[PDB]
């Protein structure tokens, strides 16, 4: 899984 | 898993 | 399981 | 399990 | 298990 | 797992 | 287990 | 595991 | 186990 | 494991 929170 | 929090 | 809380 | 709390 | 608390 | 917190 | 508290 | 806290 | 408290 | 706290 990939998580990106800007 | 990859986590990136900006 | 993956948990991310911003 | 992975836990990330920002 | 991995724990990261910011 | 990879964790990056900016 | 890995623990990181910032 | 890799941890980076900026 | 690895523990890091900042 | 690798830990870097800036």
Please tell me the distance from the alpha carbon of residue B4 to that of residue B1, in angstroms, as a whole number.
Answer: 10
What DSSP state is assigned to residue H6? -
∠I1-I5-F2 over CA atoms, to 5°? 65
With CA atoms as reference, the chain G residue closest to E5 would be G5
* Distance to chain B for D6, nearest Cα, Å: 8
Are the beta carbons of E1 and B1 closer than 8 angstroms?
no
H helix and E strand count, chain B: 0, 1
Are the beta carbons of F2 and D2 closer than 8 angstroms?
no
* Distance to chain F for D6, nearest Cα, Å: 8
The H or E element containing residue E4 is: strand E2-5
With CA atoms as reference, the chain B residue closest to F6 would be B6
CB contact under 8 A, B1 and F2: yes
Please report the resolution in angstroms: 1.6
């Amino acid at each position: 899984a990939n998580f990106l929170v800007h």
